[PDB]
């Protein structure tokens with residue numbers, strides 16, 4: 001009592017395609033990130049490990065924004081609304097992209113093909129264990145579920161169209177854009193595993209888990225401010241960190257969306 | 260996981276006032292948890308963990324479903340109702356706007372019954388993510404048992420509404436975020452200390468009565 005229409009199949013296809021072509025621009029930008037570095041007496045190696053992660057996050061933001069521009073309907077919405085959606089979804093989509101790059105055999109996370117990181121390396125880059133353990137506890141929970149590229153792409157699309165985000169002008173338009181992607185996930189999962197009906201509610205529930213992970217990310221940024229760690233404008237604006245850029249006066253996410 | 264026993268547990272229930280009504284409902288909450296399938300059969304430490312993890316969301320869900328027939332306000336179990344204009348002067352208006360828009364109006368516009376809400380509250384309750392759980396696998400199976408019963412209830416009770424089950428689950432991410440902002444405001448009341456909070460709600464905020472209530 002389920003069907004994946006030709007229209008839904010072609011929609012899912014564009015999502016996987018968009019995701020892969022964004023990864024292409026993301027892989028080109030690899031020589032831009034400061035290299036991962038015995039630490040000198042100056043203390044610069046720590047600054048280098050922090051900047052590495054910072055620049056990888058910037059690459060990850062640019063990828064999300066280019067993916068949303070390619071998710072049908074998103075560019076129809078008002079600029080205020082699309083900024084409001086990506087601001088809240090960034091960290092959620094960021095953790096989703098971290099989880100699919102988790103290797104259970106090595107217990108490591110691989111970014112941009114070459115950069116492989118363990119729980120220690122995440123700590124060395126300035127992150128706290130209160131954020132590291134949930135990152136790896138979610139990564140290995142995403143693995144148990146064992147998603148494909150179509151499932152990841154649909155879940156990212158559903159996450160973007162969460163009407164409840166702060167400063168969403170037209171919640172009605174956003175809730176309307178979400179439902180076709182939700183029915184496409186229901187159909188795809190039921191056609192993928194005809195025997196396991198629990199696949200789809202298990203996927204939707206991961207969006208609830210992402211909400212806690214955002215809350216845990218906020219605790220990490222609060223800690224970064226104690227540590228006098230300076231986030232670049234783009235990250236400061238998306239996550240409301242520093243006075244100036246945190247006010248959105250810089251209008252980066254806006255300029256990024258414009259072109 | 261029978262839906263009728265979930266509905267039976269739901270129907271089983273007959274400013275400073277929000278803090279009063281919350282503390283009152285915490286006792287009621289333990290009586291609802293015992294009634295819902297396979298909960299009492301679960302380890303005593305896990306039942307504490309589960310109730311300590313979701314009490315905020317579980318009550319916000321109950322207050323939202325009660326307020327279905329009242330405009331711009333929340334109907335507390337005490338009998339008194341709190342309006343939007345008082346919430347905005349209390350300095351807790353923005354989050355109050357979020358509860359009515361995302362939870363109350365949605366539950367109203369979709370005519371969410373007490374069986375569906377019971378299933379959602381049971382999904383909220385059986386959280387395998389709760390910190391310190393001895394056996395998180397058995398908590399996951401039970402939560403999955405709810406998905407199965409709710410989807411089956413949904414298709415039978417509401418045919419020609421094939422996206423209803425999802426619409427019910429999609430309130431949960433919003434509820435999680437709302438519960439988090441609801442809990443930070445309660446901590447401000449506890450840190451400021453304008454009007455003292457009752458012992459059970461004080462036990463929930465601080466991290467006794469709960470252990471005594473379990474048997």
Ligand SMILES: CC(C)[C@@](O)(C(=O)N1CCC(C2CCN(c3ccc(C(=O)N(C)C)c(Cl)c3)CC2)CC1)C(F)(F)F
Nearest residue numbers: 023026053054056057059060094097098111112127220
């Ligand atoms: C930015 C960073 C200093 C930090 O503020 C933070 O918020 N982090 C959470 C997100 C995490 C990112 C790391 C980079 N990222 C990806 C994820 C995937 C890829 C990838 O391979 N793509 C093809 C996109 C790439 Cl290039 C980057 C997602 C998780 C880094 C730590 C802090 F760690 F909390 F301090």
